[PDB]
Write a protein that binds this DNA or RNA. Structure first.
Lengths: 188, 201, 51, 132, 100, 179
RNA sequence: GCCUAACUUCUCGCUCAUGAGACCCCAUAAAAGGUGUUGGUUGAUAUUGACAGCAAUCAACUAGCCCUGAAAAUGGAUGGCGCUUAAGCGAGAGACCUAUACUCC
RNA sequence: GUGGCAGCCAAGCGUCCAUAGCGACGUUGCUUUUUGAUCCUUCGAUGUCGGCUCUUCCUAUCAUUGCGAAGCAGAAUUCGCC
């Protein structure tokens, strides 16, 4: 069944603008600007008023209609990124071996050492627009921060999956660095 | 129904099989066909389908002597040429003489860089439902062994820049021609009456 | 190691569901396997806990 | 992105089929494909047509769901839809093509002569402008 | 029927056909990738295989059993007199490869 | 087997009765509404159903009258409800479907086409129990209900237009969007 | 649709398959499954505001298409190319092509 | 049919626990590297066992690469996927 019309709207708080057209959005706020392309979906996106963006679909099937809220949530994430940003805190857990985490290449690469005592050095590059920092106060804590949630979470996932155990049971060899918290930069 | 010249067809945004069938019919009917930008032709369905189909095609080689087996061309132009060949009685003299009238190119050779190309609306990819993936023969050729994707891309970029400059000049001259007709109005008013009365403006 | 870190690691390593047809590591609160090989089998078992 | 919509009262132009080249008013929508239209003042009977054969114009009448032939006719002549449509390039092109298709051999000769003279004069003026 | 006992095939099929070389001179089928930063230099030279000898050299290879020990090694002498530059040619990329 | 050939099946009223015999000098008169391509098929299906329902077959009966029924007002749109019984490859089922049309015959033709499309059911495996006109608020199918809105509006998003009497090739650009 | 004479003809649906499907005999496929999607049956809750989170919903069934079940040896077969609001599946409509068949000479 | 291989329901084994790994009573398939049944081709002849030698192909995967699950704390071992 092809529903005649189905739409959703996103409302923008004060201080941020979107200026959408041709299915590419250009959200801008205090923390810069994020541009996202949504041309893989054949919906109609337009400005209705001053701070409302409407995403609409004519004659869509279940699978196409499922994407309206997806796009709206993506735009909401852009708003959050430009207002308060994104910050992922990850904790290192080990039984015996301290996981030594450092930054090199102009603070653009994360190096993991001593993970389970292996002499190999694990190198993870950081996506553009994302930064990293070790906590000097809270030990064993690494923070990856940025505007774009997609890239921030991709960097966090890269770091988390970089540390994996092999040939030993993960039910009790729990060593590794895990994403413990997902929050915003500005205290909410 | 024969065309005096060769038919120059811009391959961009055309469905492979539909364009191939139309071109094969024209070749059999006696025309010469030149297809430009064969790397811009598209095939319906996700990329994996086409990639696996071409891999299975690659697997077809003579066990005794692969130099005899099927010849798997990787260039987009040769891919389109073989697709058209499949739609012709190429094992007969008729089919051979028809196929020898086809020229398929990647990009726009300097010979045709200064001519107007055609499209077949019945073969455009925009007949597909918008929610339907499609692959590009350029990407398929690159992933199956074509070695000149970047060279063609650079040459096409230079061509597009030159064409944009030419079109800016042409826009200027067209505005000038409109102004010239406006100025000529007093002299041509006698003839414009007949033109408009017979409905031509 | 500290119990909160134990729990954090177990949340990713042990607290998951295993499909009984393809052994796919699946989310705990799941109803069907996400893998096409088993045809989205609806019968699953918890990942074997430390006994 | 979409300005003209299939709505009750929308004036459509029959692009192909039975009554090709005429205008009618949407009086009902049966489903996503079929629409009941009635162009009483444009010589179109109350019928059901596939949207594939129709083209949306810029005129919308203030009609009622399933408005009868009388009401749709009253609205048509009240809005003067036909004059306004004839004002548009849409109708001007159609009239020009209608005149074109019926030209005689003598008229074709006259058109050729006048057109080539006009082109020559316009080329002279274009050369003048290009020199400056 | 399968062969009773397995054994690798004789010879490398990627070096076939075992035919006389088309030319007496070796054809350079590929050149080192060009780096614009490095100083201008040539990438090849011609010589003649004069013969073989053997040499004694002191080996510096930490962790090896012959570290800091002398070893005898066979070597080949290639006589390479200076080469005269007689011409310059250039290649332009085209949709079918480089072209002189 | 029976096939619903012809666009817009015709509608007939068929009245018949068993041929009177000595033991039954007066026989009941039976009447049915049958949608069929022509009146020969109408009579055939009439006898099919009457033989199913009462102990009488074409040999022992006769057709008092066969007439065609024409839509009273084909200038108005109605919602039609269709109760049908049909056989799948495995079992027998009863369905209630809804359509929107200006003619009951058109609605029944739509029903045949829809069953063919959605359940691969042929005309010989379908019996039309009943066809009626349903009010707007008595409808119970979303596809039909969504069109009971006086403010209904929608564009034509992606219009692919077919050239009819011209050459296959052109220099014109193709536009699928019309605002 | 092209091989191939005859429409990329007309109307309504369904189908996305990491090699889908494609026409009597005919050139293999089953039990059992899918919270993929599309229709139906039955029983409940819900505006005395139904399920989730600190305005329709829930449950069991049913049958169309698609998917899993589905492993063989030279490289290979809806006949091939290809085809995805199809050039596939089902119901239909106009016209058209074509026998040593029918009519006439 | 027989031979070989793979599935479905679970009565039970598995210290407790049908499904880690198995799985009776039943039951659905696949294959032609077994042996049978037939007698279609060959009796104006297709040289009939095994081994040696040499290619290529298929996997229902023993090993190796990448992984998932264990009645996976590790030499080790088992099941499963590409």
């Amino acid at each position: 069944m092809k529903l005649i019309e189905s739409n959703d709207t996103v409302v923008f708080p004060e201080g941020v603008t979107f200026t959408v057209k041709n299915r590419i959005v250009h959200v801008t706020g205090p923390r810069g600007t994020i541009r996202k392309d949504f041309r893989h979906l054949h919906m109609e996106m337009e400005r209705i008023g001053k701070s409302t963006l409407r995403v609409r679909k004519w004659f869509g099937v279940r699978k196409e209609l499922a994407a309206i809220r997806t796009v709206c949530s993506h735009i909401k994430n852009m708003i959050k990124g430009v207002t308060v940003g994104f910050r992922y805190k990850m904790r290192s857990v080990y039984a015996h071996f301290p996981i030594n985490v450092t930054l090199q290449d102009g603070n653009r690469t994360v190096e993991i050492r001593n993970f389970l005592g292996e002499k190999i050095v694990r190198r993870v590059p950081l996506p553009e627009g994302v930064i990293a920092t070790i906590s000097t106060a809270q030990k064993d804590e690494i923070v990856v921060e940025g505007n774009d949630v997609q890239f921030v979470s991709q960097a966090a996932a890269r770091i988390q999956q970089s540390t994996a155990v092999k040939e030993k049971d993960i039910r009790k060899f729990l060593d590794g660095i895990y994403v413990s918290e997902k929050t915003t930069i500005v205290p909410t | 129904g024969l065309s005096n010249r060769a038919i120059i067809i811009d391959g961009k945004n055309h469905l492979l099989g539909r364009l191939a069938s139309i071109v094969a019919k024209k070749l059999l009917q006696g025309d010469k066909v030149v297809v430009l930008r064969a790397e811009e032709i598209v095939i319906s369905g996700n990329f994996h389908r086409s990639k696996l189909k071409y891999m299975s095609f690659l697997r077809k080689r003579c066990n005794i002597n692969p130099a005899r087996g099927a010849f798997h061309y990787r260039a987009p132009g040769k891919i389109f040429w073989r697709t058209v060949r499949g739609m012709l009685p190429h094992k007969t003299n008729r089919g051979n003489e028809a196929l020898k009238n086809l020229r398929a190119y990647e990009g726009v050779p300097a010979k045709y860089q200064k001519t107007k190309s055609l499209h077949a609306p019945s073969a455009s990819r925009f007949r597909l439902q918008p929610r339907r993936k499609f692959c590009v023969v350029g990407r398929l050729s690159h992933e199956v062994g074509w070695q000149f994707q970047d060279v063609v891309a650079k040459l096409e970029a230079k061509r597009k820049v030159k064409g944009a400059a030419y079109f800016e000049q042409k826009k200027k001259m067209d505005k000038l021609a409109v102004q010239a007709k406006k100025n000529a109005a007093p002299k041509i008013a006698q003839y414009q009456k007949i033109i408009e009365a017979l409905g031509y403006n | 190691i500290e119990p909160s870190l134990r729990q954090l690691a177990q949340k990713y390593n042990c607290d998951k569901q295993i499909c009984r047809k393809c052994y796919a590591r699946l989310p705990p609160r799941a109803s069907n396997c996400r893998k096409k090989k088993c045809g989205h089998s609806s019968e699953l078992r918890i990942k074997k806990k430390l006994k | 992105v979409f300005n003209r919509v299939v709505q009750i009262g929308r004036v459509v132009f029959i692009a192909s089929g039975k009554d090709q080249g005429k205008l009618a008013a949407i009086v009902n929508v049966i489903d996503g494909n079929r629409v009941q239209i009635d162009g009483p003042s444009s010589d179109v009977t109350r019928t059901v047509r596939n949207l594939k054969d129709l083209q949306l114009t810029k005129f919308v009448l203030k009609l009622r769901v399933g408005q009868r032939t009388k009401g749709v006719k009253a609205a048509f002549d009240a809005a003067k839809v036909t004059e306004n449509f004839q004002k548009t390039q849409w109708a001007k092109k159609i009239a020009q093509r209608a005149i074109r298709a019926k030209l005689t051999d003598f008229e074709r000769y006259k058109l050729m002569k006048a057109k080539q003279m006009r082109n020559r004069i316009v080329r002279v003026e274009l050369a003048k402008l290009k020199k400056a | 029927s399968h062969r009773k006992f397995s054994a690798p095939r004789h010879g490398h099929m990627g070096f076939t056909p075992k035919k006389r070389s088309r030319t007496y001179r070796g054809r350079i089928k590929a050149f080192p990738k060009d780096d614009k930063s490095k100083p201008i230099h040539l990438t090849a030279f011609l010589g003649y295989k004069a013969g073989m000898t053997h040499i004694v050299r002191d080996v510096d290879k930490p962790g090896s059993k012959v570290n800091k020990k002398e070893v005898v090694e066979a070597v080949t002498i290639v006589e390479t007199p200076p080469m005269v530059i007689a011409g310059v040619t250039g290649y332009v990329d085209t949709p079918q490869g480089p072209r002189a | 087997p029976t096939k619903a050939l012809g666009e817009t099946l015709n509608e007939y009223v068929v009245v018949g009765r068993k041929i009177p015999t000595e033991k039954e000098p007066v026989t009941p008169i039976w009447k049915m509404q049958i949608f069929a391509t022509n009146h020969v098929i109408a009579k055939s299906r009439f006898w099919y159903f009457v033989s199913m329902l009462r102990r009488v077959k074409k040999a022992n009966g006769e057709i008092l009258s066969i007439k065609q029924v024409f839509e009273k007002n084909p200038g108005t749109v109605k919602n039609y409800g269709v109760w049908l019984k049909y056989d799948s490859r495995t079992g027998h089922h009863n369905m209630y479907r809804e359509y929107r049309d200006t003619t009951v015959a058109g609605a029944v033709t739509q029903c045949y086409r829809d069953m063919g499309a959605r359940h691969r059911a042929q005309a010989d495996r379908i019996h039309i129990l009943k066809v009626q006109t349903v009010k707007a608020e008595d409808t119970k199918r979303a596809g039909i209900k969504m069109f009971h809105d006086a403010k209904i509006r929608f564009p034509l998003p992606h219009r692919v237009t077919k050239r009819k009497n011209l050459s296959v090739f052109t220099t014109a650009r193709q536009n699928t969007h019309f605002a």
